[PDB]
Coordinates of C-alpha atoms and ligand atoms in Angstrom, one line a residue:
Chain Z
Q1 CA -2.2 -2.3 -3.4
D2 CA -4.3 -2.7 -6.5
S3 CA -7.3 -3.1 -4.3
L4 CA -8.4 -1.6 -0.9
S5 CA -11.6 -1.7 1.1
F6 CA -12.6 -0.7 4.5
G7 CA -15.9 -0.3 6.4
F8 CA -17.0 1.7 9.4
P9 CA -20.5 0.5 10.4
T10 CA -20.2 3.0 13.3
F11 CA -17.3 5.1 14.6
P12 CA -16.1 4.0 18.1
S13 CA -14.1 6.5 20.1
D14 CA -10.9 4.4 19.6
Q15 CA -9.7 5.2 16.1
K16 CA -6.2 4.5 14.7
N17 CA -6.6 5.0 10.9
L18 CA -8.3 8.4 10.7
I19 CA -6.7 11.7 10.2
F20 CA -8.6 14.4 12.0
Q21 CA -8.3 18.0 10.8
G22 CA -9.9 21.2 12.2
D23 CA -12.8 20.6 14.6
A24 CA -13.6 17.0 13.7
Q25 CA -14.0 14.5 16.5
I26 CA -15.8 11.3 17.5
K27 CA -18.9 11.7 19.6
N28 CA -21.3 8.9 20.5
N29 CA -20.1 6.5 17.9
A30 CA -20.3 9.0 15.1
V31 CA -18.0 11.6 13.6
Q32 CA -18.9 15.2 14.3
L33 CA -17.3 17.1 11.5
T34 CA -18.2 20.5 13.0
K35 CA -17.9 21.7 16.6
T36 CA -20.7 21.4 19.1
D37 CA -21.1 22.7 22.6
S38 CA -21.3 20.6 25.8
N39 CA -25.1 20.2 25.2
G40 CA -24.4 18.7 21.7
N41 CA -25.7 21.8 19.9
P42 CA -24.0 23.2 16.8
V43 CA -21.9 26.4 17.0
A44 CA -20.9 29.0 14.4
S45 CA -17.5 29.4 12.7
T46 CA -16.2 25.8 12.6
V47 CA -14.5 23.6 10.0
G48 CA -13.5 19.9 10.3
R49 CA -12.5 17.1 8.0
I50 CA -11.4 13.4 8.3
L51 CA -9.3 11.4 5.9
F52 CA -8.6 7.7 5.9
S53 CA -4.8 7.2 6.5
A54 CA -4.0 4.7 3.8
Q55 CA -3.5 6.2 0.4
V56 CA -5.7 5.0 -2.5
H57 CA -4.2 4.1 -5.8
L58 CA -6.6 5.9 -8.2
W59 CA -4.8 5.3 -11.4
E60 CA -1.5 3.8 -12.6
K61 CA 0.4 5.5 -15.5
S62 CA 2.6 2.5 -16.2
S63 CA -0.2 -0.1 -16.7
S64 CA -2.8 2.3 -18.1
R65 CA -5.2 1.2 -15.4
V66 CA -7.8 3.4 -13.6
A67 CA -9.6 2.4 -10.4
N68 CA -13.3 1.9 -10.1
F69 CA -14.5 2.9 -6.6
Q70 CA -17.6 3.0 -4.5
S71 CA -18.2 5.0 -1.3
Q72 CA -21.3 4.4 0.7
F73 CA -22.1 6.6 3.7
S74 CA -24.9 8.1 5.7
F75 CA -25.1 11.4 7.6
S76 CA -27.6 13.6 9.4
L77 CA -27.8 17.4 9.8
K78 CA -29.5 18.9 12.9
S79 CA -30.1 22.6 13.7
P80 CA -32.3 24.8 15.9
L81 CA -32.4 27.2 12.9
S82 CA -34.4 26.4 9.7
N83 CA -31.6 27.6 7.5
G84 CA -28.7 25.4 8.8
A85 CA -25.4 25.8 7.0
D86 CA -23.1 25.1 5.3
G87 CA -23.0 21.6 4.2
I88 CA -21.0 18.3 4.1
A89 CA -18.9 16.9 1.3
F90 CA -17.2 13.6 0.4
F91 CA -13.9 14.4 -1.3
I92 CA -10.8 12.9 -3.0
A93 CA -7.6 14.9 -3.0
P94 CA -3.8 14.6 -3.0
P95 CA -2.5 12.8 0.2
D96 CA -1.0 15.9 1.8
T97 CA -4.2 17.9 1.7
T98 CA -4.9 20.2 4.6
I99 CA -7.6 22.8 5.4
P100 CA -7.0 25.8 3.2
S101 CA -6.7 29.2 5.0
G102 CA -10.1 30.9 5.1
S103 CA -12.0 28.0 3.7
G104 CA -14.8 28.2 6.2
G105 CA -18.5 28.8 5.6
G106 CA -19.7 28.2 2.0
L107 CA -16.2 27.0 0.9
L108 CA -16.9 23.9 3.0
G109 CA -13.3 23.6 4.1
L110 CA -12.3 22.6 0.6
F111 CA -11.2 25.7 -1.2
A112 CA -9.3 28.9 -0.5
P113 CA -11.2 32.2 -1.0
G114 CA -8.8 33.5 -3.7
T115 CA -8.8 30.4 -5.8
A116 CA -12.2 28.8 -5.0
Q117 CA -13.4 29.2 -8.7
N118 CA -10.0 28.7 -10.5
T119 CA -10.1 25.2 -11.9
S120 CA -6.4 25.2 -12.7
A121 CA -5.3 26.1 -9.1
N122 CA -7.0 23.1 -7.5
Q123 CA -6.9 19.3 -7.4
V124 CA -10.0 18.0 -5.8
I125 CA -13.2 16.1 -6.7
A126 CA -16.0 16.4 -4.2
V127 CA -19.7 15.5 -3.9
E128 CA -21.3 18.3 -1.8
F129 CA -24.6 18.4 0.1
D130 CA -25.1 22.1 0.2
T131 CA -27.8 23.6 2.4
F132 CA -27.0 27.4 2.3
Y133 CA -27.3 29.4 -1.0
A134 CA -27.7 33.1 -0.1
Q135 CA -26.6 34.9 -3.3
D136 CA -24.7 37.5 -1.4
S137 CA -22.1 35.1 0.1
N138 CA -22.5 32.0 -2.0
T139 CA -22.6 33.7 -5.4
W140 CA -21.7 30.5 -7.2
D141 CA -24.7 28.5 -5.9
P142 CA -28.1 27.8 -7.6
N143 CA -30.9 29.4 -5.6
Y144 CA -32.0 26.3 -3.6
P145 CA -30.6 23.5 -1.5
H146 CA -28.7 21.0 -3.7
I147 CA -26.3 18.1 -4.2
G148 CA -23.4 18.9 -6.4
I149 CA -20.4 17.4 -8.1
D150 CA -17.4 19.7 -7.7
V151 CA -14.3 19.3 -9.9
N152 CA -11.6 21.8 -8.9
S153 CA -14.1 24.5 -8.1
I154 CA -16.7 25.4 -5.5
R155 CA -18.9 26.1 -8.5
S156 CA -20.4 22.7 -9.2
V157 CA -20.2 21.3 -12.7
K158 CA -23.5 19.6 -12.1
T159 CA -26.3 19.9 -9.4
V160 CA -29.7 18.5 -8.6
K161 CA -32.2 20.2 -6.3
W162 CA -32.2 18.5 -2.9
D163 CA -34.4 18.7 0.3
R164 CA -32.8 19.2 3.7
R165 CA -34.5 17.2 6.4
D166 CA -33.5 18.1 10.0
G167 CA -32.4 15.0 12.0
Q168 CA -33.0 12.5 9.2
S169 CA -30.2 10.3 7.9
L170 CA -29.4 10.4 4.2
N171 CA -27.9 7.3 2.7
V172 CA -25.5 8.0 -0.1
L173 CA -23.8 5.8 -2.8
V174 CA -21.0 7.4 -4.9
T175 CA -19.6 5.3 -7.6
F176 CA -17.0 5.8 -10.4
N177 CA -16.8 3.5 -13.4
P178 CA -13.5 3.9 -15.3
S179 CA -15.1 2.2 -18.4
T180 CA -17.6 5.0 -18.9
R181 CA -15.9 7.6 -16.7
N182 CA -19.2 8.3 -15.1
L183 CA -19.2 9.5 -11.5
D184 CA -22.7 8.6 -10.2
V185 CA -24.4 9.8 -7.0
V186 CA -27.5 8.3 -5.5
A187 CA -28.9 9.7 -2.3
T188 CA -32.0 8.4 -0.5
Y189 CA -34.0 9.1 2.7
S190 CA -35.6 6.1 4.6
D191 CA -39.0 6.8 3.1
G192 CA -37.6 6.2 -0.4
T193 CA -37.2 9.8 -1.6
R194 CA -34.3 9.5 -4.1
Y195 CA -31.9 12.1 -5.6
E196 CA -29.5 11.3 -8.5
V197 CA -26.8 13.3 -10.2
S198 CA -24.0 12.1 -12.5
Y199 CA -21.1 13.5 -14.4
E200 CA -18.5 12.2 -16.9
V201 CA -14.9 13.0 -15.7
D202 CA -11.5 11.7 -16.5
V203 CA -9.9 11.4 -13.0
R204 CA -6.5 11.0 -14.6
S205 CA -6.4 14.6 -15.7
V206 CA -7.6 16.0 -12.3
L207 CA -5.9 14.0 -9.6
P208 CA -2.5 12.4 -9.0
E209 CA -2.0 8.6 -9.1
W210 CA -2.2 8.3 -5.3
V211 CA -4.9 10.1 -3.3
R212 CA -6.6 10.2 0.1
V213 CA -10.4 10.2 0.5
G214 CA -12.5 11.7 3.3
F215 CA -15.2 14.2 4.3
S216 CA -15.3 17.9 5.0
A217 CA -17.9 20.2 6.6
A218 CA -18.2 23.7 7.8
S219 CA -20.5 26.3 9.3
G220 CA -20.1 30.1 8.9
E221 CA -22.6 32.4 10.6
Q222 CA -25.4 29.9 10.1
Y223 CA -24.8 26.5 11.7
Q224 CA -25.9 22.9 12.0
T225 CA -24.3 19.6 13.0
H226 CA -22.7 17.5 10.3
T227 CA -22.8 14.0 11.6
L228 CA -21.2 11.2 9.7
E229 CA -22.8 7.9 10.9
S230 CA -21.3 5.2 8.7
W231 CA -18.9 4.8 5.8
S232 CA -17.6 2.0 3.6
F233 CA -15.2 2.3 0.7
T234 CA -13.8 0.0 -2.0
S235 CA -11.5 0.6 -4.9
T236 CA -9.9 -1.7 -7.5
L237 CA -7.5 -0.9 -10.4
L238 CA -9.0 -2.2 -13.7
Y239 CA -7.7 -2.1 -17.3
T240 CA -9.4 0.7 -19.2
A241 CA -9.8 -0.3 -22.8
Chain I
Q1 CA -12.8 0.2 10.7
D2 CA -14.5 -3.1 11.6
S3 CA -13.4 -4.5 8.2
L4 CA -10.2 -4.0 6.2
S5 CA -9.0 -5.6 3.0
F6 CA -6.1 -5.1 0.5
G7 CA -4.5 -6.9 -2.3
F8 CA -1.1 -6.8 -3.9
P9 CA -1.1 -9.2 -7.0
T10 CA 2.5 -7.8 -7.5
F11 CA 4.6 -5.1 -5.9
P12 CA 5.4 -2.2 -8.2
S13 CA 8.2 0.1 -7.0
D14 CA 5.9 2.9 -6.4
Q15 CA 4.6 2.1 -2.9
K16 CA 2.8 4.3 -0.4
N17 CA 1.2 2.1 2.2
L18 CA 4.1 -0.2 3.2
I19 CA 6.5 0.4 6.1
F20 CA 10.0 -0.9 5.2
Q21 CA 12.3 -1.9 8.0
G22 CA 15.9 -3.2 7.8
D23 CA 17.1 -4.1 4.3
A24 CA 13.7 -4.8 2.8
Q25 CA 13.0 -3.1 -0.6
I26 CA 11.2 -3.7 -3.8
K27 CA 13.0 -5.1 -6.9
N28 CA 11.5 -6.5 -10.1
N29 CA 7.9 -6.1 -8.9
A30 CA 8.5 -8.2 -5.7
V31 CA 9.6 -7.5 -2.2
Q32 CA 13.2 -8.6 -1.4
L33 CA 13.1 -8.9 2.3
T34 CA 16.8 -9.6 2.6
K35 CA 19.6 -7.7 0.9
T36 CA 21.0 -8.8 -2.4
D37 CA 24.1 -7.5 -4.2
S38 CA 24.1 -5.7 -7.6
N39 CA 23.8 -9.1 -9.4
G40 CA 20.7 -10.0 -7.3
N41 CA 22.6 -12.6 -5.3
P42 CA 21.9 -13.1 -1.6
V43 CA 24.4 -11.8 1.0
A44 CA 25.0 -12.8 4.6
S45 CA 24.0 -10.8 7.7
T46 CA 20.8 -9.1 6.6
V47 CA 17.3 -8.6 8.1
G48 CA 14.3 -6.9 6.6
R49 CA 10.6 -6.6 7.3
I50 CA 7.5 -4.9 5.8
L51 CA 4.2 -4.0 7.5
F52 CA 1.0 -2.6 6.0
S53 CA 0.6 1.0 7.2
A54 CA -3.0 0.8 8.3
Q55 CA -3.6 -0.8 11.7
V56 CA -5.9 -3.8 11.8
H57 CA -8.6 -4.0 14.5
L58 CA -8.0 -7.6 15.7
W59 CA -10.4 -7.6 18.6
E60 CA -12.7 -5.2 20.5
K61 CA -13.0 -5.4 24.3
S62 CA -16.1 -3.2 24.5
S63 CA -18.1 -5.3 22.0
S64 CA -16.7 -8.7 22.8
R65 CA -15.9 -9.2 19.1
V66 CA -12.8 -10.9 17.5
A67 CA -11.7 -10.6 13.9
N68 CA -11.9 -13.4 11.3
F69 CA -8.9 -12.9 9.0
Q70 CA -7.3 -14.5 6.0
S71 CA -3.9 -13.8 4.6
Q72 CA -2.9 -15.3 1.2
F73 CA 0.6 -14.9 -0.1
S74 CA 3.3 -16.5 -2.2
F75 CA 7.1 -16.3 -1.9
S76 CA 10.2 -18.1 -3.3
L77 CA 13.7 -18.7 -1.8
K78 CA 16.9 -19.0 -3.9
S79 CA 20.4 -19.8 -2.9
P80 CA 23.7 -21.2 -4.4
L81 CA 24.4 -22.8 -1.0
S82 CA 23.3 -26.3 0.0
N83 CA 22.0 -24.8 3.3
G84 CA 20.2 -21.5 2.6
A85 CA 19.1 -19.6 5.7
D86 CA 17.3 -18.4 7.6
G87 CA 13.7 -18.2 6.6
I88 CA 10.6 -16.0 6.2
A89 CA 7.7 -15.3 8.4
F90 CA 4.2 -13.8 8.2
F91 CA 3.6 -12.0 11.5
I92 CA 1.1 -10.0 13.6
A93 CA 2.4 -7.7 16.3
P94 CA 1.7 -4.4 18.1
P95 CA 1.6 -1.3 15.8
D96 CA 4.9 0.1 17.0
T97 CA 6.9 -3.1 16.4
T98 CA 10.5 -2.6 15.1
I99 CA 13.4 -4.9 14.4
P100 CA 14.8 -6.1 17.8
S101 CA 18.5 -5.6 18.5
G102 CA 20.4 -8.8 17.6
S103 CA 17.3 -10.4 16.0
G104 CA 19.3 -11.6 13.0
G105 CA 19.8 -15.1 11.7
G106 CA 17.8 -17.8 13.4
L107 CA 15.7 -15.2 15.3
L108 CA 14.2 -14.2 11.9
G109 CA 14.1 -10.5 12.8
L110 CA 11.3 -11.2 15.2
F111 CA 12.9 -11.8 18.6
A112 CA 15.7 -10.5 20.8
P113 CA 18.3 -13.0 21.9
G114 CA 17.7 -12.6 25.6
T115 CA 14.0 -13.2 25.5
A116 CA 13.6 -15.3 22.3
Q117 CA 12.0 -18.1 24.3
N118 CA 10.3 -16.2 27.1
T119 CA 6.6 -16.1 26.2
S120 CA 5.7 -13.5 28.8
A121 CA 8.2 -11.1 27.3
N122 CA 6.8 -11.0 23.8
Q123 CA 3.7 -10.1 21.8
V124 CA 3.8 -11.8 18.4
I125 CA 2.1 -14.5 16.4
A126 CA 4.0 -15.6 13.4
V127 CA 3.9 -18.4 10.8
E128 CA 7.5 -19.3 9.9
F129 CA 9.0 -21.2 7.0
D130 CA 12.3 -22.1 8.5
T131 CA 15.1 -23.5 6.3
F132 CA 18.0 -23.6 8.7
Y133 CA 18.0 -26.0 11.7
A134 CA 21.6 -26.6 12.8
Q135 CA 21.2 -28.1 16.2
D136 CA 24.2 -26.2 17.6
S137 CA 23.0 -22.7 16.8
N138 CA 19.2 -23.1 16.3
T139 CA 18.8 -25.4 19.4
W140 CA 15.1 -24.7 19.6
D141 CA 14.4 -26.2 16.1
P142 CA 13.4 -29.7 15.1
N143 CA 16.1 -31.3 13.0
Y144 CA 14.7 -30.6 9.5
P145 CA 13.2 -27.7 7.5
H146 CA 9.7 -26.9 8.7
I147 CA 6.7 -24.7 8.9
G148 CA 6.1 -23.5 12.4
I149 CA 3.5 -21.5 14.3
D150 CA 5.1 -19.2 16.8
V151 CA 3.3 -17.6 19.7
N152 CA 5.5 -15.3 21.7
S153 CA 8.6 -17.5 21.2
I154 CA 11.0 -18.6 18.5
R155 CA 10.5 -22.2 19.8
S156 CA 7.4 -23.0 17.8
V157 CA 4.3 -24.2 19.6
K158 CA 4.0 -26.6 16.7
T159 CA 5.9 -27.6 13.5
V160 CA 5.4 -29.8 10.5
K161 CA 8.0 -31.2 8.1
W162 CA 8.4 -29.1 5.0
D163 CA 10.5 -29.3 1.9
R164 CA 12.5 -26.3 0.7
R165 CA 12.5 -26.1 -3.1
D166 CA 15.0 -23.6 -4.6
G167 CA 13.4 -21.0 -6.9
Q168 CA 9.9 -22.5 -6.7
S169 CA 6.9 -20.4 -5.4
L170 CA 5.0 -21.6 -2.4
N171 CA 1.4 -20.4 -2.1
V172 CA 0.2 -20.0 1.5
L173 CA -3.2 -19.4 3.0
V174 CA -3.3 -18.4 6.7
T175 CA -6.8 -18.1 8.3
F176 CA -8.1 -17.5 11.8
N177 CA -11.7 -18.4 12.8
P178 CA -12.7 -16.6 16.0
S179 CA -15.5 -19.1 16.7
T180 CA -13.2 -22.1 17.0
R181 CA -10.1 -20.0 17.7
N182 CA -8.3 -22.1 15.1
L183 CA -5.3 -20.6 13.2
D184 CA -5.0 -22.7 10.1
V185 CA -2.1 -22.8 7.6
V186 CA -2.2 -24.4 4.2
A187 CA 0.7 -24.2 1.8
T188 CA 1.2 -25.7 -1.6
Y189 CA 3.7 -25.9 -4.4
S190 CA 2.6 -25.8 -8.0
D191 CA 2.8 -29.6 -8.4
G192 CA 0.1 -30.0 -5.7
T193 CA 2.4 -30.9 -2.8
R194 CA 0.5 -29.7 0.2
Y195 CA 1.4 -28.9 3.9
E196 CA -1.1 -28.2 6.6
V197 CA -0.8 -27.2 10.3
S198 CA -3.4 -25.8 12.7
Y199 CA -3.3 -24.5 16.3
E200 CA -6.0 -23.3 18.7
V201 CA -5.1 -19.9 20.1
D202 CA -7.1 -17.0 21.8
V203 CA -5.5 -14.0 20.1
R204 CA -7.1 -11.7 22.8
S205 CA -4.7 -13.0 25.4
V206 CA -1.6 -12.6 23.2
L207 CA -2.1 -9.4 21.2
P208 CA -3.5 -5.9 21.7
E209 CA -6.8 -4.8 20.1
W210 CA -5.0 -3.0 17.3
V211 CA -2.0 -4.6 15.4
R212 CA 0.0 -4.4 12.3
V213 CA 0.6 -7.3 9.9
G214 CA 3.6 -8.0 7.7
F215 CA 6.5 -10.2 6.9
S216 CA 10.0 -10.7 8.2
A217 CA 13.1 -12.6 7.0
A218 CA 16.7 -12.8 7.9
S219 CA 20.0 -14.4 6.9
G220 CA 23.0 -14.9 9.3
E221 CA 26.1 -16.8 8.2
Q222 CA 24.2 -18.7 5.6
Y223 CA 22.0 -16.9 3.1
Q224 CA 19.3 -17.0 0.5
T225 CA 16.9 -14.5 -1.0
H226 CA 13.4 -14.2 0.6
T227 CA 11.1 -12.9 -2.1
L228 CA 7.5 -12.0 -1.4
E229 CA 5.7 -12.2 -4.7
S230 CA 2.0 -11.4 -3.8
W231 CA -0.2 -10.8 -0.8
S232 CA -3.9 -10.3 -0.1
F233 CA -5.3 -9.8 3.4
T234 CA -8.9 -9.4 4.7
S235 CA -10.1 -8.9 8.3
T236 CA -13.6 -8.4 9.7
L237 CA -14.8 -8.1 13.3
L238 CA -17.4 -10.8 14.3
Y239 CA -19.5 -11.6 17.4
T240 CA -18.1 -14.6 19.3
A241 CA -20.9 -16.6 21.0
Ligands
LIG1 O1 22.4 -18.2 9.0 C1 22.7 -19.4 9.7 C2 23.1 -19.1 11.1 O2 24.2 -18.2 11.2 C3 24.7 -17.9 12.5 O3 25.3 -19.1 13.1 C4 26.7 -19.2 12.8 C5 27.1 -20.6 12.8 O4 26.7 -21.2 14.1 C6 27.2 -22.6 14.2 O5 28.5 -22.6 14.1 C7 26.6 -23.5 13.1 O6 25.2 -23.6 13.3 C8 26.9 -22.9 11.7 O7 26.2 -23.7 10.7 C9 27.1 -24.5 9.9 O8 27.6 -25.6 10.6 C10 26.7 -26.6 11.1 C11 27.4 -27.6 11.9 O9 28.8 -27.7 11.5 C12 25.9 -27.1 9.9 O10 24.9 -28.1 10.3 C13 25.3 -26.0 9.1 O11 24.6 -26.5 7.9 C14 26.3 -25.0 8.7 O12 27.2 -25.5 7.8 C15 26.4 -21.4 11.6 O13 26.9 -20.9 10.4 C16 23.6 -17.3 13.3 O14 23.2 -16.1 12.8 C17 22.4 -18.3 13.4 O15 21.3 -17.6 14.1 C18 21.9 -18.5 12.0 O16 20.8 -19.5 12.0
CA2 CA1 -23.4 27.0 -0.4
CA3 CA1 15.8 -22.0 12.2
MN4 MN1 -23.1 24.5 -3.8
MN5 MN1 12.0 -22.9 13.5

């Protein structure tokens, strides 16, 4: 299809079009990307991701068209610790993507340790909400919590300082305009606190024509819940001239 | 997802979200439901269907909601014969639906001979454009080409006279309003000739909560091509009160 849209105001337990990977699962009308105990508390060493089953036609070589897309979602992070880790990310990747071996902790379940910073060995665009930046284990991170745009590397091409608020939902809008090639990210808390980060990228040189979209999250030694509360997505192929 | 939408203005050969069954395949940017030889001419004894891969949430028992949906599509039929057969149908059925054994010809690839008219043995709602009505083989049909609404039986709950026009595209809009429980069908030819038929049906008592949607066509002894040219579909769960 030239156009595709879907919306999950909430996540009922009965799902048919979601691909669950790792520890991801539905809990109380929300997607818990990372594992939690029976009490609902976060645990260490866990990775989980979800992808929508239908493939998205990002670009078409034969017609010279590139899709514009918009992804709106909200999530909350909760943790008994003040330094919860590791973060959640919205990502776009080839349809057969699976959790890379050893991609836990700071790699957010998106990159393999050996090639995490090799831009020619990966095919992924992600928007990360990174809460852990210890320079001993996350050597690629700026020294503060941040939102980042990742293009084939865990080392963000662009970041903006961000504030982690335990238990508060963050509303996010990610948009891509093929006319300008700008990938824009706008995140806001209910009180109006806003964060913005943008980057120009030619999706045609990074990802294949058909892709799958979803979310990934992980916790290494430090932990926190990564709760996806709602998600809507829309994409439409347009003539880029 | 509570809401799902997709649009195929045309059907390029590179498809990823369509389930092809029987002889259905893409040719010349359109879906040829029934088999055609090397010259593109229709052949006898063929059946084919396509379904969109993502499942549609038709209704939700826990929230008492039912989907409002709209399916817009266009197709054309062509045959050297004076009596092209057998017809094409838009249908909604359980996710695991497959072509029934012996469902060829007048059964349109939707029903099995033994239970074709047994309503308690089927789970399918379809809108058929039936061009073959020989009273000796298709005993259930009115004696003329027609548009019919089928609910768990090949014997339409309702039919309206229709004119088959060789090589001309018919644009169809099928809508379901959960408030009134009305399934409306409006079809038009490019010269403004219009056909309308409506039926009140509670989809909750006919189909499961999750279903797949698609098209089916067949040709028995007599034949014609059944070409699906475009298709857009949208569904959204709504409160019924
Ligand atoms: O695809 C059409 C039809 O094919 C299969 O039925 C086989 C034949 O069954 C009967 O003999 C007739 O209906 C015949 O139709 C011809 O004869 C009719 C009466 O002489 C005439 O009205 C028709 O126009 C035609 O010339 C069928 O060919 C079987 O697969 C059916 O399900 C299917 O609908
Ligand atoms: Ca980090
Ligand atoms: Ca018939
Ligand atoms: Mn980071
Ligand atoms: Mn009929």
